[PDB]
Amino acid sequence: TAREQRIQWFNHDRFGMFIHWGLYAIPARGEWVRSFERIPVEDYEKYFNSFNPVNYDPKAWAKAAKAAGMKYAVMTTKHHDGFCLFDSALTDYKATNTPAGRDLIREYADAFRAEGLKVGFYYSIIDWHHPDYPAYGDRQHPMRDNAEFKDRPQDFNRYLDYMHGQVKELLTNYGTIDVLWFDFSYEDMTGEKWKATELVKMIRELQPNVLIDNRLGGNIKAREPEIYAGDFASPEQLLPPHGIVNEDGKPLPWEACITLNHHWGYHAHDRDYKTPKQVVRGLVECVSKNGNMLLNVGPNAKGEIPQLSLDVLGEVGAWMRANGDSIYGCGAAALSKPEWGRYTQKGNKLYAHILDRGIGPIALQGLNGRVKEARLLADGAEVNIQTPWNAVDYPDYLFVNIPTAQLPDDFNTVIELTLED
């Protein structure tokens, strides 16, 4: 019941902003740059010492997210590079010791909270800076192939204490936190290796309603999962072909995390953006399969969401002002996907998402005499659903009649169907 209760807002809200920001925004080629260029800590220091986000305005970020129709955010407090954007009492490697001279995470949390957005923190359990985190031979440590680190003396338990402490700070010093998005478990760096059981007990004594993703280890699909296996699953850079279900076939909460371009952190030459049309359609696809979408922005080193990112969000937002009822509080319908688009549903309201006008009337299989009313969501206008003369040979189908050659909305034209009961 507690599990079911704390996840309600999340399932209802459907659409979030991911935010990846850090020192990596200066090299501006990806958050993994220490790893793929094997950059030791001394060489990353020039980014630490020059990080000065003079145009950082998270109230403008939050207004952008809200206007986009997003209901929650998740921001990187510390990525794999170990740099804390928050004012930790446990390290010096944090934004308050850069020219930023401030807690960037407090500004984020206050701005998003004040717009009515739920406040999420991302926290990398990987740490390429902490000297006790394993390095020589690790799958992706920057110094994984540097023999100067082989058999260097380490106590992983100190890293864990550090990590457990930082999580405590995040859940004590920033008000109410709706999501903790850990990242990620791999090979033997999974489960109890993090003291995950203990981590999660501590978390639920501090903020019992917080939602955790499924990256600490374990198996969220098990009927009786471990305590750290997560409240929701997190497919990445794809939309599952089917909603994610557990081993009994029960729907699990899930959220697809998706980049706007191809990159999480700011990438100075990646302008290969998704269109607002694809963003809308992906959100609708996630909802149509009982899931959420977490759409990422990577702000530049000056602390700006890139203009192309904002242009996309503004148009998505225009669509959501008209069509949001078919997203918020909605889920999958018990019908196969139709030829012409997708369905989402909320009680006795079945939303037909017309992605492809086709030619002539639109055929909704299995719904003849199950629909009491049909209305265009965007304007509340009646849609004619009488079988036209040229379609009388197809009585298993309901027909929607659109008298224009093109749809009124090319992103997605939504028809609200009120089902008989």
Ligand X SMILES: OC[C@H]1O[C@H](O[C@H]2[C@H](O)[C@@H](O)[C@@H](O)O[C@@H]2CO)[C@H](O)[C@@H](O)[C@@H]1O
Ligand Y SMILES: OC[C@H]1O[C@H](O)[C@H](O)[C@@H](O)[C@@H]1O
Residues that bind a second copy (CB under 8 A): 25-29, 46, 50, 53, 235-241, 256, 258, 261-262, 266, 268-269, 272-275, 278, 281-282, 285, 300-302, 304, 306, 337, 339, 355-361, 363, 365, 373, 375-376, 379-382, 388, 390-391, 393-394, 397, 403-406, 408
Residue nearest to ligand Y (CB): 264
183 binds, among ligand Y, a second copy, ligand X, none (CB under 5 to 8 A by kind): ligand Y
Count the site residues for ligand Y by CB under 6 A: 7
5 binds, among ligand X, a second copy, ligand Y, none (CB under 5 to 8 A by kind): none
241 binds, among ligand X, ligand Y, a second copy, none (CB under 5 to 8 A by kind): a second copy
Question: Can you tell me which residue has the tokens 């989402």?
Answer: 344
Please, which residue, 100 or 335, has the CB nearer to ligand X? 100
Alpha helices in 68-155 (DSSP H): 104-114
Contacting residue, 99, 388, 395, 408, with ligand X by CB under 6 A: 99
Contacting residue, 84, 111, 233, 257, with ligand Y by CB under 6 A: 257
Separation of alpha carbons 416 and 375, rounded Å:
5
Separation of alpha carbons 292 and 277, rounded Å:
17
- Least distance to ligand Y, CB of residue 351, Å: 29
Q: Is there a contact between 64 and 310 (Cβ–Cβ < 8 Å)?
A: yes
Count the site residues for ligand X by CB under 6 A: 14
Structure tokens given for 358: 């086709």
Please give the C-alpha separations between residue 166 and each of 9, 160, 170, 371, in angstroms, as whole numbers.
26, 10, 6, 54
Stretch in the footprint of ligand X (CB under 6 A) among 48-56, 186-194, 202-210, 273-281: 48-56
Query: What is the pattern of x (binds ligand X, CB under 6 A) and - over residues 311-340?
Result: --------------x---x-----------
The H or E element containing residue 203 is helix 196-206
Q: Does 184 bind ligand Y (CB under 6 A)?
A: yes
Separation of alpha carbons 253 and 347, rounded Å:
18
Task: Give the N- to C-terminal CA distance of the chain in Å, as an integer.
Answer: 29
Classify residue 252 by its DSSP letter: P
Give the pairing type, strands 211-212 and 179-183. Answer: parallel
Alpha helices in 93-133 (DSSP H): 104-114
- Least distance to a second copy, CB of residue 194, Å: 22
- Least distance to ligand Y, CB of residue 123, Å: 10
359 binds, among ligand Y, ligand X, a second copy, none (CB under 5 to 8 A by kind): a second copy
- Least distance to ligand X, CB of residue 359, Å: 26
Structure tokens given for 119: 């406040």
257 binds, among a second copy, ligand X, ligand Y, none (CB under 5 to 8 A by kind): ligand Y
Q: Does 416 bind ligand Y (CB under 6 A)?
A: no
Q: Is there a contact between 353 and 417 (Cβ–Cβ < 8 Å)?
A: no
Q: Is there a contact between 385 and 369 (Cβ–Cβ < 8 Å)?
A: no
Q: Does 270 bind ligand Y (CB under 6 A)?
A: no
184 binds, among ligand Y, a second copy, ligand X, none (CB under 5 to 8 A by kind): ligand Y
The residues, any chain, with a CB within 8 Å of residue 350's CB and separated by 6 or more, are 333, 343, 344, 367, 371, 417, 418, 419
Please, which residue, 11 or 296, has the CB nearer to ligand Y? 296
Question: Can you tell me which residue has the tokens 């920057």?
Answer: 142
Please, which residue, 289 or 346, has the CB nearer to ligand X? 346
Contacting residue, 54, 114, 222, 381, with ligand X by CB under 6 A: 54
Separation of alpha carbons 277 and 312, rounded Å:
9
CA dihedral 379, 295, 335, 323 (to 10 degrees): -10
Q: Is there a contact between 158 and 132 (Cβ–Cβ < 8 Å)?
A: yes
406 binds, among ligand X, ligand Y, a second copy, none (CB under 5 to 8 A by kind): a second copy
Separation of alpha carbons 140 and 421, rounded Å:
57
Please, which residue, 112 or 264, has the CB nearer to ligand Y? 264
Separation of alpha carbons 94 and 72, rounded Å:
25
Three-class SS of residue 275?
A: coil
Q: Footprint of ligand X on this chain (CB under 6 A)?
A: 50, 52, 54, 99, 325, 329, 346-349, 375, 380, 416, 418
Q: Footprint of ligand Y on this chain (CB under 6 A)?
A: 20, 31, 183-184, 236, 257, 264
